[PDB]
Design a protein around this ligand. Structure first.
Ligand SMILES: CCCCCCCCCCCCCCCC(=O)O
Ligand SMILES: CCCCCCCCCCCCCCCC(=O)O
Lengths: 267, 58, 252, 59, 54, 267, 252, 54
């Protein structure tokens, strides 16, 4: 993807006006710097390969982290899948209005020892289970539940001390693209929920320890990473100026357009 | 699952004319209803069913 | 001479003697739905002369301390002729638009306007917990206006209408990434934008979803001297293009 | 009528007026309790998305 | 087995192992440009040397 | 496996009656919606690939879990192989009358520390043995037994902290298909056992620790997962309405056909 | 078997298991206006699925002392869907019709009905000096009924509704010169008539002129024995065919 | 080595390593339909436009 090269030029005295235009037409001028001054011939070998949509968006970014305790009544974690609780991936995806990609999912699981009271605490290797429930299915209510039978829901098992678990997800949607912005309601009477919460229905993700609480409590933490593959994008958008405040909507507090200086001629 | 963004509508039934019956015939009748799918029906994204329970092993 | 146009749609005509070029969307002209992209399987309705014509909204006054105006686009035409009657009896629909903003003044006035068209312009609220209710987000062919101040948090359901944030939390100078034109009273008299159908689905309901927003923001304010005409109106004219509908039912 | 064979029968009389309603239900083949438990509505409860037409036969 | 060109400033080999097309690697080498739909979205074309309004 | 597409149609006034039929013949009507109303031409690209018998049944499902303790007299576990103690796989397999598949077997083994009394408890890595005895062979009676010599019975060994063990099983049967339902007895005099227990003879699965009880008790738990491959199916069946009560038979308590509403015209 | 039909128009369908033939006008099927007969020179509107469909009017009870009913045809469909909305915004229009009258009873009932369609059925008044006012000549999809007696001259603006004169001063037995069918409860269950556009001008205004009239007259009265069903309704279903409009203006 | 078609909305390679046919992978790509044995199990064929009983 090489860039255009420079063409040599000569002194002119003519009727053609490249520098004069009209910006009132909504049309950006197509002048090169070899029209306003004398240039030399320069062969450019630079490429635009690092600014593609396939290269700008295909990196792993953290979206959530949750904790769950071993020695606890109903100690397990849940998360409703969205991309609006972090500030860095939300600003990158909201440069466009419609997106369409595959996904790559990676989990990072740690553990920590809690202040127990017994002597000679020695625990074996821990095993974790991460379950995905599509919308409409049965959900777990506790740790020893029948809902963890995973007969048709996809799940994964992992033992501590190995490579992190990874899997792929295709373009799961009902429409033809994902929508970052929705200007409308969910009811036909125009009441209630207004915004992007009317389109978010992706499921819930559950996490638990498979072992038993032997002689000491253990507190674990999972971290989730998103990586879009095979990306298409439509209708670009200005970047966000103000800071994000909530998750469901786009409410903000107003702020200035830039920072200030002391004069108009200050360099 | 139930979702107001992807609703499908309503199915009703009305009387066009009456049920006219002779003498020595019972007026009250009955109607049965059936349902199936056409040849363009399809499904996606297999999950679990909410129509079964368990507490302990059988 | 590039300075003259003539647009003919149905039984209506616009004539202009002082104009810039015509901006066409993202390079795409409006067209009907094809057989490869269709999902609703019954036959659509195409009236095509009773709906595809120029409808004129109300007029607003450009004052000196004026901040801006906006319109939600498949909502101002909800009581206009036979276009607003097909929306009530049908469930689906898709439309392209042709917008013509027009404002004239003499050679002794000055000022500049930006006329953009924003797809999916979701707006924010002044109270940080709620969302704005319907009466503030749009009106029936009547402009909702910005203001140069900041709406306080003591109100519950009102739009945050600071102009430099454009209602959406972004910079107002970066709104030129959308298809737009300018009206400069030194040289220009009108602006014309042709927009195709933009959505993530091939058809949509036109009463729960506004998929376009037309904003008019004065960057350079209106100025004149003593003796010149103080009343300057702005008028907007919208024409639907290649409209079709599906799903007949009761009147809603 | 749910613990009976009377749940499948739709009553029909001879009236003294005109334009009365016989039945009515919303078309939700996997969430509405009318079409929930049928042969079509049990296969749909193993999946999440569905698409196509639906036949309704009356005898 | 696909043999591609291996971006420099030499080839490599690639085989697919899974049955679904969502399991492949990223594209990373689809360089295509069309800036005219954003920078010149006008009806009549405008020559650079001619004036904008006649 | 693309679905059929829609054909355009015109207004009719004729003798042909597609909407009128007779459901008394036991024959489902073959009408498309382009016979009862005016349609447009629509090309469908949808596929029926996710509803195949190879895609509906080829997922891993838990069938049993058992525990066994290290510091215990006769501490080991046994299980007679069947698919009728869980509620989610039993309902999926009983949509058909006859089935024929290969198998894939996966085990998930954990451990836990029991409240010992000694100081400085530190145990090495644990090793487990899982043995399969076909019907008729010798069975273990304790942990230090001669029956664990596994000369011809297949067994597996596994050390804690690695990938889970996995193996394949072919279609082992005496008939031509597996039978989910059997309407008959095992005696010719029509006495005694009635039902599916007359056809179940698959063997027993044994589990033990190979290490010795060093200085502290350890309680382990294995979990078993089934995955049918190369599936054929015959004679479909209505799904089960009532809840399962036992394992050997199909006894139930009666329940209503659906849930109720308040009127026949309630939407 | 000639006894079954199936008519499909838009998103609606009629099915019949006991029927006579279909009567087609004067041998002519409805069609659009040609280029040789047109006079209005702007482009017409043809919605063609939103208007050309079956609309069902109210039902009337066939009693024993029952005399007849009538309907004025481009007036009962004046509040029906998108057909009645195109009539309000346009000035001209032309339409053909499809009428389906339906009445069922058992094998133990008897009676006969005549279903005719009369073009330009101008009616008379009971007072010999005046003409009947609008409220008696037609109703909004509600039947106006004849009577077996004679309306007195003491009333001022009322229609003379004696059945044997058919409201027009002619013999009621000679109404079979118009396109018609019979409903005989011994053999028949319905009647279907297809009517083209009949006028002396190619288009006409649909609010000042009714160009068709549908009459249903019981020649043999309804009779049954004790125990049979006493309530017998009659239902009418009309579908416009090949409708087009001209002259957009305000809503009237 | 088998080269197959890799379901999309591109190929892949597959080699078998074991001696028994019960050790292979799942089929997952055998799309075959015969709905007529359940929906129309009658003796004489029935045309849609004709009546059912004559
Ligand atoms: C163990 C398997 C886990 C399966 C996880 C599947 C998660 C689904 C991913 C949904 C992508 C969400 C994209 C953003 C949605 C939107 O912007 O509207
Ligand atoms: C370590 C090797 C373990 C070998 C395990 C072999 C288990 C045999 C599997 C039998 C399949 C049972 C299928 C259901 C039987 C039925 O429904 O009647």
């Amino acid at each position: 993807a090489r860039v255009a090269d420079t063409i040599s030029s000569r002194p002119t005295n003519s009727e053609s006006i490249p520098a004069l235009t009209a910006a009132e037409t909504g049309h950006t001028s197509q002048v090169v710097p070899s029209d306003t001054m004398q240039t030399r011939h320069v062969k450019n070998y630079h490429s635009r390969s690092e600014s593609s949509i396939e290269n700008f968006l295909c990196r792993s970014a953290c979206v959530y982290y949750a904790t769950y305790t071993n020695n606890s009544k109903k100690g397990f974690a849940e998360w409703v899948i969205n991309t609006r609780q972090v500030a860095q991936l939300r600003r990158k995806l909201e440069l466009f209005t419609y997106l369409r990609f595959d996904l790559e999912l990676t989990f990072v699981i740690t553990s920590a020892q809690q202040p127990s009271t017994a002597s000679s605490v020695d625990a074996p290797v821990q095993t974790h289970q991460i379950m995905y429930v599509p919308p409409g299915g049965p959900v777990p209510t506790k740790v020893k539940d029948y809902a963890w039978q995973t007969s048709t829901n996809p799940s994964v098992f992992w033992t501590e001390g190995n490579a992190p678990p990874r899997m792929s997800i295709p373009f799961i949607s009902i429409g033809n693209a994902y929508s970052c912005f929705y200007d409308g309601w969910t009811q036909f009477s125009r009441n209630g929920v207004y915004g992007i919460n009317t389109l978010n229905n992706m499921g819930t993700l559950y996490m638990r320890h498979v072992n038993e609480a032997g002689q000491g409590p253990i507190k674990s933490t999972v971290r989730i990473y998103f990586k879009p593959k095979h990306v298409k994008a439509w209708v670009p958008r200005p970047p966000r100026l103000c800071q994000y405040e909530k998750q469901k909507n786009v409410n903000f507090s107003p702020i200035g357009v830039t920072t200030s200086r002391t004069d108009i001629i200050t360099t | 699952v139930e979702d107001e963004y992807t609703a499908a509508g309503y199915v009703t039934c009305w009387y066009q004319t009456n049920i006219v019956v002779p003498a020595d015939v019972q007026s009250s009748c009955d109607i049965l209803c059936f349902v199936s799918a056409c040849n363009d029906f399809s499904v996606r994204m297999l999950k679990d069913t909410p129509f079964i329970r368990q507490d302990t092993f059988y | 001479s590039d300075r003259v146009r003539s647009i003919t749609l149905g039984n209506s005509t616009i004539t202009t003697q002082e104009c810039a070029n015509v901006v066409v969307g993202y390079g795409v002209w409006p067209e009907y739905l094809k057989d490869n992209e269709a999902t609703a399987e019954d036959q659509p309705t195409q009236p095509d002369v009773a709906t595809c014509r120029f409808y004129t909204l109300e007029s607003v006054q450009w004052m000196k301390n004026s901040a801006g105006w906006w319109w939600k686009l498949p909502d101002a035409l909800s009581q206009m002729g036979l276009f607003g009657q097909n929306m009530q009896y049908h469930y689906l629909g898709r439309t392209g638009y042709t917008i013509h903003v027009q404002c004239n003044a003499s050679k002794f006035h000055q000022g500049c306007l930006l006329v953009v068209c924003v797809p999916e312009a979701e707006m924010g609220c002044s109270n940080l917990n709620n969302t704005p209710e319907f009466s503030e987000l749009s009106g029936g062919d009547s402009a909702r206006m910005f203001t140069d101040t900041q709406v306080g948090e003591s109100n519950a359901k009102k739009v945050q209408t600071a102009v430099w944030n454009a209602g959406m939390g972004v910079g107002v100078g970066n709104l030129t990434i959308f298809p737009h034109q300018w009206i400069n009273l030194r040289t220009n008299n009108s602006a014309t934008l042709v927009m195709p159908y933009i959505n993530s689905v091939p058809m949509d309901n036109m009463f729960r979803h506004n998929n376009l927003t037309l904003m008019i923001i004065p960057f350079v304010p209106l100025n004149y001297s003593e003796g010149s005409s103080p009343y300057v109106p702005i008028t907007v004219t919208i024409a639907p293009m290649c409209a079709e509908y599906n799903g007949l039912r009761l009147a809603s | 009528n749910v613990s009976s064979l009377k749940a499948y029968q739709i009553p029909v009389q001879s009236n003294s007026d005109n334009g009365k309603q016989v039945f009515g239900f919303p078309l939700q083949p996997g969430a509405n309790n009318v079409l929930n438990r049928t042969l079509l509505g049990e296969i749909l409860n193993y999946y999440t998305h569905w698409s196509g037409s639906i036949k309704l036969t009356f005898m | 087995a696909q043999v591609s060109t291996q971006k420099t400033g030499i080839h490599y080999t690639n085989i697919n192992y899974y049955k679904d097309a969502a399991s492949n690697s990223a594209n990373r080498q689809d360089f295509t440009q069309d800036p005219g739909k954003f920078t010149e979205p006008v009806k009549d074309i405008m020559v650079k040397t001619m004036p904008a309004l006649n």
